[PDB]
Amino acid sequence: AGIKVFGHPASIATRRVLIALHEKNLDFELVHVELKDGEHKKEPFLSRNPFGQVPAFEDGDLKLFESRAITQYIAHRYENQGTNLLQTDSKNISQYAIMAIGMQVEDHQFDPVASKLAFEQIFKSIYGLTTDEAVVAEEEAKLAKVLDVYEARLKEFKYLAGETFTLTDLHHIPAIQYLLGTPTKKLFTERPRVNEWVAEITKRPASEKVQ
Amino acid sequence: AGIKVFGHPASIATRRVLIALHEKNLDFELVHVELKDGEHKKEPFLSRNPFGQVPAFEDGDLKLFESRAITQYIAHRYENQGTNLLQTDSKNISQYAIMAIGMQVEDHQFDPVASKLAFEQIFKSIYGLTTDEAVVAEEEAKLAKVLDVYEARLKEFKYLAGETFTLTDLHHIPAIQYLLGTPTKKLFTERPRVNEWVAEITKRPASEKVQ
Amino acid sequence: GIKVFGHPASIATRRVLIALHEKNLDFELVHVELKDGEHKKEPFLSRNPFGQVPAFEDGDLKLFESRAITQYIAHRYENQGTNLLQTDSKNISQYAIMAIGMQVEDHQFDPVASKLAFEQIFKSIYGLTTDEAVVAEEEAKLAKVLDVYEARLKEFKYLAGETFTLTDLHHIPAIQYLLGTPTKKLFTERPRVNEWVAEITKRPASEKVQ
Amino acid sequence: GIKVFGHPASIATRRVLIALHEKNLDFELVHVELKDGEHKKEPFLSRNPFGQVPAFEDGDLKLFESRAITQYIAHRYENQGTNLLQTDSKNISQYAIMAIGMQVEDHQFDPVASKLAFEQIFKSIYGLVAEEEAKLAKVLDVYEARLKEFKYLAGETFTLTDLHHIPAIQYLLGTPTKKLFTERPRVNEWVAEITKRPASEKVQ
Amino acid sequence: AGIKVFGHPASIATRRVLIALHEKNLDFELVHVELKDGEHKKEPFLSRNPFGQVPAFEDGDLKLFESRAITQYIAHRYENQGTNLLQTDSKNISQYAIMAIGMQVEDHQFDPVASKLAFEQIFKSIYGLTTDEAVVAEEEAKLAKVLDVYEARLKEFKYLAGETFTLTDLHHIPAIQYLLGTPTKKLFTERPRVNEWVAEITKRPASEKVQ
Amino acid sequence: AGIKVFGHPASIATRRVLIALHEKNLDFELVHVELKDGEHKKEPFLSRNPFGQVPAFEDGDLKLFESRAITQYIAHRYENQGTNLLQTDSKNISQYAIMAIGMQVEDHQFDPVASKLAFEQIFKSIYGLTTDEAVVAEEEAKLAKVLDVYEARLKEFKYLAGETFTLTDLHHIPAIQYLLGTPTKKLFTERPRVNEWVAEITKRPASEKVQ
Ligand SMILES: O=c1c(O)c(-c2ccc(O)c(O)c2)oc2cc(O)cc(O)c12
Ligand SMILES: O=c1c(O)c(-c2ccc(O)c(O)c2)oc2cc(O)cc(O)c12
Ligand SMILES: O=c1c(O)c(-c2ccc(O)c(O)c2)oc2cc(O)cc(O)c12
């Protein structure tokens, strides 16, 4: 009964779902999945997601996985509550397509690079691993290209999909929160519109709740 | 100025768009982008997609890129013509979410593996390279797990998102067409429901048109 | 009093925690948030300029390096709780034999056990697929170390002699993790090593940190 | 006659093809289907037991290894078409100078150019570099210094030393690694000269 | 009978033991283990150290291996002879712990780095192998961080464990002797207290004996 | 002497040149280039070889590098002294091509494998380093395939290029000398013609001179 999220509060993909729920002021339960004990690779979690990845999700009888399918579900199902995470006119098909391009770009261009950069610079340090400075330089060069495109985009519009905050922006937040604690931060601060966009989206109450 | 697709007829992502257009019986122009001459990495193509990847797309004044954003746009904008590529009740939000899970899974689990297997076994030959049999074995093991999940899913429903053919199924077609010309074919034929599903979706007139 | 600055999941931190519990000492565990890089910032760097958990405090005495901290606990609080030194702690040859084993844990066991844990547990957190070649290479190394331990444990009940000491204790946290992986088989296929693992992991101080 | 058993896209096969065209020789290209593992089966293994394209035939003479084949072509058909040896081919010191360059192409250039051309052509196209470019830059700095002193790498004329680079360079010119060539004025001229040759354009 | 060291006079770990024996003015025999013939990886050396590393050690019936266990044994067993290698008040437990921190740091932070640097720059050169300049640059950056810490430490105290020379200092000597014959030398000379410390500990008669 | 070799006596490539000079009974000077002091990476060595590798070579005013270009030069320039290192009829172009195939095969197929096997089993073991048994097994499998080809070849002819000893055989000698001091020896002894060939070429006076 009600809304449940099956994940881990440090997980980027889990936080993506958590932020959207808070944006909608929805009540939910966070059911912790213990990644260190391989709980995500065992039953009964595998019955919620056979690919063994956090998060999984429940709204009454509806069972979901994949963070970006979950956020979009939340944005449609609870459209008329809290922050609107869709475009202002959500029935406008061309406007939706524009938001969708950005969501695809976050997934394909931004997320894999931002992840490697977080792994090399934060998570390797945890254990006993030295950060490979060549990977860092190569990935930062890739991230810089992505952010150059974003800079051009944000000269034209207040947010990535148009004049309002949407899922396109929201999906970037968790990876950005981690990158802000690394020297990769400079890539954001050296680009004026990107920098303002990062400051706006990370200062939101829903973003701060999961941090 | 009607519908234009800027891509290459051999490209998997381009074919994804082409199949959807044909499913809708839409008229369009395919404008050839010459990948061999790096036309995708030059202006004016970069003004249609700053990431330098085929396909880009145009419908009148609307300019898009990312194959799966384009197909979705087609499925909504031209919903009431040709094959319905959305769920039967397209305003059902839970049902949309279920289709979206499958589209995410195709993108994250299927496509990277099916693409490597096509590169190693088909497209390395184009450049005079030999196929690395270790990569082939490794990627086939991954593909087998994905297809085991699909097999279980297709015991329960006729197609991956439910009773009816949708974008979830369509998105797999181009990679599958290529994999059918390789020994990786056995992974599909080994699995009775998967095999039927492949035979159904590849025999469709829209699928055969791009082949 | 006694403070430990670390993280309860950390192998090195657990090494110190187990020794404190073995001595029935009261202490405060002050959490250092590794995910936020707290270990690479001040004020933690003023306790350990190498940016590694754990650091440690006993009144005015400030320490780091888990195995230096354990030793000290064993000496400073020798006459309370479990004796973590040799039975006759003033016997110099007997101390040297314990010290060989502590050096071997550090050089031969720990780096290998740590790679095996990273590949098989901690990569799975994050997105990453375990490199099966590293796992096979490291397991071959670990097998050689454990063959030496097996021979040793045919002669003596524990690694330094007839009693449980720091030499055994220092292995416990890495072993607790490796027991949750298929590397477990390397322990179970060696009868004396298997018994030794079961004995040291079942200790109340070991179970406390798990 | 002359037969080449290989694949037209293959760098090593193209090396042989260019030398044959330079000599205006007639030959048959017999396609070996790498995708079906034809190179790892009989009867190709009876032409090269190492299972690599190209293999080669001139009448009864059976060869493999591209750089042995090109050199054979340069000697056997010396007085026809382009001279691929040094001008005075009986000058032993001059030959040795050409041979140094042929070794350098094989050891220093080819492994690096090969990784690069392939990592990138394929990133650009099917969605699958800094270390190798740094290595290539060193090799090209040496070539730049060399080409300040002489028109081509072995001296004043085009030889096997230059020819052996062509196929890898043709691929690298379709990638951003092109900048390493254009950054270096003498290298850039050399690349333009050797890639514009009719024999080079024939295999492209 | 008596004290025997089973090792090789060029070995770093062997020299560690030799320096401590000379500091105590002890008589001993060095029994040569021929590394070039793999004598360390054969019986009977394996019966003295099953890990196949020099040195092994004997004091009457007591059989040892691991250089730092051997040096500590020497420092305790023969405490009241020659140079005191322990702290001035050797029964002071906190003072011992401070020496032990430094010994742990030498082992974990200094030695693996110094050792890679010596292998790359000196030992590969003996056999005509080429030094990997990337490893050298990477490891020097690490060594610089360790030596910055040592510099700060040596501003406060004359030696690393306090006011007197101890095992903490001694354990560094052999690696340093080798690194002084390489360009890595500059890392010691550019740090004024480190440089003084190096000059003091390498000019000791026991240090010069093994050089 | 008119002839100088700038190298290191342990270096496989240097020894290749040395053996050829001794085969011709030529007088020469070996100048030992000090790798430990980075002499190979400094002027004036870099004027002999801008790639900073041993050997370089001088015959009067002629300056060369690359071992196999040097040996070939020696074989031509001093053809009618000492051992003939070319084919019996050195002007026979097809016969030269057959020798050239073998020299290419040594370079590409034999040398990189034999080198790794020597590094893993000889160079590393001397120091502290554990020989990676997976690399050894992988490389031995490759070497076995090469030696199977050689076995078939040596059933047909006395040496690898035909009836007489040539550069094709000579170029293998230094790597083989090292591999004979390792368990990889078995790969040579288990193949009867290969074994006879190894015994013949390693027992030559010129081969023994550099050992
Ligand atoms: O219910 C949903 C929905 O109606 C649409 C939608 C509507 C108009 C469009 O133009 C469009 O592209 C998508 O998207 C979704 C996307 C998801 O990921 C999940 C959903 O539950 C919906
Ligand atoms: O106080 C300590 C001490 O006395 C000894 C010691 C005693 C006898 C021996 O034979 C020996 O090898 C070591 O070790 C220590 C090691 C530490 O890290 C911390 C300590 O406080 C002590
Ligand atoms: O002087 C040389 C020479 O004449 C030839 C040559 C001659 C006839 C042939 O058929 C052939 O293939 C090569 O090769 C060489 C190869 C070198 O590396 C160095 C040289 O100095 C010569």
Question: What are the DSSP calls for chain D, one per residue?
Answer: -EEEEE-TT-HHHHHHHHHHHHTT---EEEE--GGGTGGGSTTGGGT-TT--S-EEEETTEEEE-HHHHHHHHHHHTTTSSS--S-SSTT-HHHHHHHHHHHHHIIIIIHHHHHHHHHHHHHHHHH---HHHHHHHHHHHHHHHHHHHHSSBTTBSS--HHHHTTHHHHHHHTTSTTHHHHHTSHHHHHHHHHHHSSHHHHHT-
Residues D98 and D179 in one domain: yes
Count the residues in chain A. Answer: 211
Nearest to B21 by CA among B1, B45, B6, B5: B5
Burial class (CB in 10 A: 0-12, 13-18, 19+), E122: middle
Residue B159: helix, strand or coil by DSSP?
A: strand
Residues B21 and B125 in one domain: no
Domain end position, chosen among A86, A106, A126: A86
Residues B67 and B91 in one domain: no
Residues C188 and C169 in one domain: yes
Can you name the residues that pair with D5 across neighbouring β-strands?
A: D30, D55
Quick check: CB of B76 below 6 Å from ligand 1? yes
Record the tokens describing residue B59, joined without a space: 């419908």
H or E, element range at A198: helix A192-202
Amino acid identity of E142? K
What total of structural domains would you count in chain C?
2
Domain span holding position C7 = 1-85
| Residues C55/C38, Cβ–Cβ less than 8 Å | no
The dihedrals phi and psi of E32, each to the nearest 5 degrees, come to -70, 125
Do the Cβ atoms of E38 and F127 come within 8 Å? no
Residues F69 and F104 in one domain: no
Quick check: CB of D97 below 6 Å from ligand 3? no
Query: CA B102 to CA E135: how far, in whole Å?
Result: 46
Alpha carbon distances (Å) from B58 to A71, A97, B33, B207, F175: 28, 12, 14, 22, 63
Nearest to B11 by CA among B32, B39, B25: B32
Residues B4 and B25 in one domain: yes
The enclosing domain of B57 has a CATH number of 3.40.30.10
- Using the atom order of ligand 2, give the atom closest to the CA of residue C95: 10
Residues D172 and D199 in one domain: yes
Quick check: CB of C71 below 6 Å from ligand 2? yes
User: How near does any CA of chain C get to the CA of F12, in Å?
Assistant: 29
HEC secondary structure over B64-131: EECHHHHHHHHHHHCCCCCCCCCCCCCCCHHHHHHHHHHHHHHHHHHHHHHHHHHHHHHHHHHCCCCC
Do the Cβ atoms of F128 and E36 come within 8 Å? no
Amino acid identity of E202? T
Quick check: CB of D177 below 6 Å from ligand 3? no
C72 C-alpha to ligand 2 centroid (Å): 8
Record the tokens describing residue A176, joined without a space: 């950005």
Residues F77 and F126 in one domain: no
Do the Cβ atoms of D34 and B123 come within 8 Å? no
Query: CA F65 to CA F67: how far, in whole Å?
Result: 6
- List own/partner pairs for F134-139 with CB under 8 A and 24 or more apart: F134/C133, F134/C136, F134/C137, F136/F184, F139/F113
Can you name the residues that pair with A20 across neighbouring β-strands?
A: none
H or E, element range at E56: strand E56-59
User: How near does any CA of chain E get to the CA of C75, in Å?
Assistant: 7
- Using the atom order of ligand 1, give the atom closest to the CA of residue B100: 18
Nearest to A143 by CA among A120, A110, A121: A110
CA angle, B82 as apex, B78 and B84 as ends, to 5°? Answer: 75
H or E, element range at E31: strand E29-32
Q: What is the DSSP letter of C127?
A: T
Nearest to C130 by CA among C118, C142, C145, C113: C118
Q: Do chains A and F touch (3 or more CB pairs under 8 A)?
A: no
Residue B62: helix, strand or coil by DSSP?
A: strand
Residues E204 and E108 in one domain: yes
Tell me which chain B residues have a C-beta less than 8 angstroms from the C-beta of D34: 124-125, 128-131
Query: CA E140 to CA E146: how far, in whole Å?
Result: 10
Query: CA F115 to CA E187: how far, in whole Å?
Result: 34
Experimentally, the structure was elucidated by: X-ray
Sign of the four-CA dihedral B3, B7, B11, B13: negative
Alpha carbon B5 to chain centroid, angstroms: 15
Chains contacting chain C through 3 or more C-beta pairs under 8 A: A, E, F
Query: CA A126 to CA A186: how far, in whole Å?
Result: 22
The enclosing domain of A91 has a CATH number of 1.20.1050.10
Record the tokens describing residue C50, joined without a space: 């190498």
The contacts of residue E53 (CB under 8 Å, 6+ apart) are: E13, E40, E65, F128
Sign of the four-CA dihedral C33, C37, C40, C45: negative
Tell me which chain E residues have a C-beta less than 8 angstroms from the C-beta of F124: none
| Residues E180/E118, Cβ–Cβ less than 8 Å | no
| Residues D78/D85, Cβ–Cβ less than 8 Å | yes
Amino acid identity of B203? K
Write the residue in F12, F53, F125 that is nearest to E41 by C-beta: F125
- Using the atom order of ligand 1, give the atom closest to the CA of residue A97: 12
Query: CA D172 to CA D116: how far, in whole Å?
Result: 7
Residues E75 and E104 in one domain: no
Residues E53 and E16 in one domain: yes
| Residues B32/B8, Cβ–Cβ less than 8 Å | yes
Do the Cβ atoms of D65 and F105 come within 8 Å? yes
Can you name the residues that pair with E191 across neighbouring β-strands?
A: none
Amino acid identity of B109? Q
Domain end position, chosen among F58, F86, F114: F86
Query: CA C108 to CA B67: how far, in whole Å?
Result: 52
Q: Are strands E62-65 and E56-59 parallel, antiparallel or unpaired?
A: antiparallel
Burial class (CB in 10 A: 0-12, 13-18, 19+), B186: exposed
User: How near does any CA of chain A get to the CA of C124, in Å?
Assistant: 7
CB half-sphere exposure, E204, CA atoms < 13 A:
22
Query: Which residue of chain A is at minimal alpha-carbon distance from D130?
Result: A138
Domain end position, chosen among F86, F115, F139: F86
| Residues F12/F54, Cβ–Cβ less than 8 Å | no
Residues E74 and E44 in one domain: yes
From B90, B96, B168, mutation site for ligand 1 pocket: most ligand atoms within 8 A of C-beta: B96
D95 C-alpha to ligand 3 centroid (Å): 6
Nearest to B15 by CA among B73, B54, B52: B54
